[PDB]
Each structure stands twice: as structure tokens, then as C-alpha cells.
Amino acid sequence: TPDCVTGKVEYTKYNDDDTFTVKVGDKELFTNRWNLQSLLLSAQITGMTVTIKTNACHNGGTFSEVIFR
Amino acid sequence: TPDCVTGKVEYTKYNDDDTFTVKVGDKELFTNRWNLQSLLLSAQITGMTVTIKTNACHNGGTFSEVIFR
Amino acid sequence: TPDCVTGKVEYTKYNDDDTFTVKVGDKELFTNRWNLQSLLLSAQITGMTVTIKTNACHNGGTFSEVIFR
Amino acid sequence: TPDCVTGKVEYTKYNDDDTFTVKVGDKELFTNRWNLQSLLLSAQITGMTVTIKTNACHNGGTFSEVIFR
Amino acid sequence: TPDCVTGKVEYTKYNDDDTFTVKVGDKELFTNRWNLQSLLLSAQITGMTVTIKTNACHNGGTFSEVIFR
């Protein structure tokens, strides 16, 4: 899957539909994977660099693959 | 959903009905989303600025949307 | 419900019946709410001041309401 | 349940069966309590001293009661 | 289960099939145990040494047993 954005997690958002948004690089993207919520907030808090890979690489686009570096 | 309040989490409260209350800005708001409890306590502990988004923007109002910065 | 004790968590204990005990101020109290276990351990580790609210405000009293500050 | 051993968690072992071995002081002890399992991991991650309470205080002994200090 | 690799977690990856991959030593290994995800990211974050035990000890192999040190 192509890299979409890489960078520290700028901010995150818990959404009303229970999905979870991250702003990384130039994009907000959201995931419907419950498991990723804790992981991504941890990554935000600790300032980890993450790479979000998705074919739907647009603002508001969906993702389910993350590399934590 | 419009922003309701933004600030550090002044305190949180675990309620007898197992809902979870946050005090942010000038409002106590509560959520019954279990996923949010650990996210909100982490945001409080680490001193994140959160924005609670809700249409019940008044004391005692319910919410299910949060930005963590 | 009335405040019972306020202070840092002195220690916590996971009990054989799967309830969870905290010591705050001069009182040892316990809760049967699963949700509170990780929250209370996190409060303890991070040095948060908690207020345990309960009408059973005595050693061995049960509680299900906590303010984390 | 009497004290068995007090110390920092030397290692934790998540087993195939999903049981959870912990080594504290010179004792390797197993527990089947999933929640207690994740509290121990948090304790080890953050450097907490714990007291494992059990009558079966030998390698391979079981427990279900811990004091997090 | 026999030892596969021992080392710090170099990076981790959340996969589209909801399994989680760790790079330790010269191996990428993945697990389907949800519970291990947070613990493995934590080990990565804190620089903990892990020992992954599996018979599938080869790049891309699966695992379900870990010792956190």
C-alpha cells in the first residue's frame, strides 16, 4: 500500500461514529479500527513518527495501516 | 459538530452510572462512550488541550466527540 | 454523593474477587467497577489527587465515584 | 492471603495459553486473571514495586492478588 | 515454544488485517493477539528488550508468546 503521510501525530479526534481521526503530514485521515485509538494517542503523546499507508490518501480519507517509528 | 469548550482537562469524574465527566472550559460534560475514558484520563495526565464538540453545550450536556491537541 | 477522602493514591490492590482496592487519606475503600481499575492505577502511577465519593466512607467501604484531579 | 514476594517486576511473559507469568524477586509466578495481567504490565512498564500475595510462594505457584505500591 | 529473537522493538506496524508486526533483531514477526499491541508499542516507546518465542521463526512468521524485560 503506498505511503500516504508521515510525521508526528499533530492532533487526533474521536468521532461521533466511534471512528478516530489523525492529522499527520498534510492530511486528516480516519480509521474505523478500534485498536488503533489507544495506539495513535500513545504515538501522539510520545511524539513518535508514524507513517500512514492508504490508497485513499485525501483529507478525510480512510486508513487501516500504520507504521510506528 | 460545533466546538463547545476548549482547554486543559480540569478534572474528570467516573460516575456511578459508569459514564465519565470532564470539566473543560466552563462546563462539565459527560460521555457514555467507554473508549473515551482512558483517552480522556491520558489527555488530562499529559496536559493536552482538548476541544469537546457537542450540541448539548451546557453543564451536564452529553458529548461523544473530542479533539486532542 | 458525599466526598469521602481526598489525596494521592497510597497503594492499590487487585483482590481475589476481582474488585479493586485503593488507599486514599486514612481510608481503604474498594470498587467493583472494572472500568476503574486501569484508571485508578494510572492515577496512582502519575500522582494524581483523587477524591473518592461514597456514603460508605469507612475502611472496607465500597465506592463507584471518583474525581481525578 | 499472606505476602509472597515484593519487588519490581523483572519480566512478564505472555504465554500461548494467554496466561501471564511474572518474575518478582527470586519467584516466577503465574496468574490466569486477564485484568490483573494488564495491571502488572503497566506496573512493570512504569517501574512500580509490587507485592504478589499467595500461599503458593514457589516457582510455578499461582496468584490472584497483587498490591501495587 | 522455542526462542526466536531477543532485542529492542525497532518499529511496529498495524496491518490492514488487524494483526500487528514487530521488528526485533533481523526479523519481522506478527501477532493476531489484540492484547499484545499496546504492550509491544509500549516496549518500543520505552526501549524495553523483548524475547519473542515462536516456531515460525522467520521473517513474516507469526507469534503469540512474548517475554517483556
The domain ranges of chain A are 1-69
Q: What dihedral angle (degrees, nearest 10) is formed by the CA atoms of E26, E32, E35, E38?
A: 40
Task: Identify the helix (H) or strand (E) that includes residue D7.
Answer: strand D3-14
Q: CB of E55 within 8 A of CB of E64?
A: no
In the chain, the amino acid numbered C22 is V
Residues C2 and C55: their CA atoms lie apart, in Å, by 6
B1 min Cα distance to partner chain C (Å): 27
Q: Is A32 on the interface with B (CB under 8 A)?
A: no
Residues of A in contact with B38 (CB under 8 A): 38
| Nearest neighbour of B11 by CB, restricted to C1, C38, C67 | C67
Q: Is C48 on the interface with B (CB under 8 A)?
A: yes
**β-bridge mates for residue A17, sequence order:** none
Neighbours of A13 (CB within 10 A): 19
Q: Of the candidates B6, B12, B17, B61, which has an alpha carbon nearest to the alpha carbon of residue B36?
A: B12
Q: Of the candidates D39, D18, A40, D61, which has an alpha carbon nearest to the alpha carbon of residue E66?
A: D18
Residues of B in contact with C54 (CB under 8 A): none
| Nearest neighbour of A68 by CB, restricted to E12, E16, E18 | E12
Is A39 close to E14, i.e. CB distance below 8 A?
A: yes
Which resolution, in Å, applies to this structure?
A: 1.6
Contacts of C14 by beta carbon, 8 Å cutoff, 6+ apart: C20, C37, D33, D35, D36, D39, D64, D65, D66, D68
Residue A37: phi and psi, rounded to 5, are -65, -55
Residue E48: phi and psi, rounded to 5, are -65, 150
**CA-derived radius of gyration, chain B:** 10
Way the structure was solved: X-ray
Query: ∠ CA D60-D63-D68 to the nearest 5 degrees?
Result: 120
Closest chain A CA to residue E35: A35
Is A14 close to B35, i.e. CB distance below 8 A?
A: yes
Q: Is A14 on the interface with E (CB under 8 A)?
A: no
- C and E make contact (3+ CB pairs below 8 Å): no
Q: CB of D66 within 8 A of CB of D52?
A: yes
In the chain, the amino acid numbered B56 is A
Q: Is B41 on the interface with A (CB under 8 A)?
A: no
Max CA separation in chain D (angstroms): 29
CATH architecture of A1-69: Beta Barrel (2.40)
Q: CB of C28 within 8 A of CB of C60?
A: yes
- A and E make contact (3+ CB pairs below 8 Å): yes
For chain A, report the end-to-end CA distance as a whole number of angstroms.
Answer: 17
Burial class (CB in 10 A: 0-12, 13-18, 19+), D40: buried
B54 min Cα distance to partner chain C (Å): 22
Contacts of B27 by beta carbon, 8 Å cutoff, 6+ apart: B4, B5, B52, B57, B58, B59, B61
Q: How far is CA D54 from the centre of its chain?
A: 10
Query: ∠ CA B38-C42-D53 to the nearest 5 degrees?
Result: 125
Q: What dihedral angle (degrees, nearest 10) is formed by the CA atoms of E8, E10, E13, E18?
A: -20
Is B41 close to C42, i.e. CB distance below 8 A?
A: yes
E37 min Cα distance to partner chain A (Å): 8
Contacts of E59 by beta carbon, 8 Å cutoff, 6+ apart: E26, E27, E28, E29
**β-bridge mates for residue C68, sequence order:** B12, C50
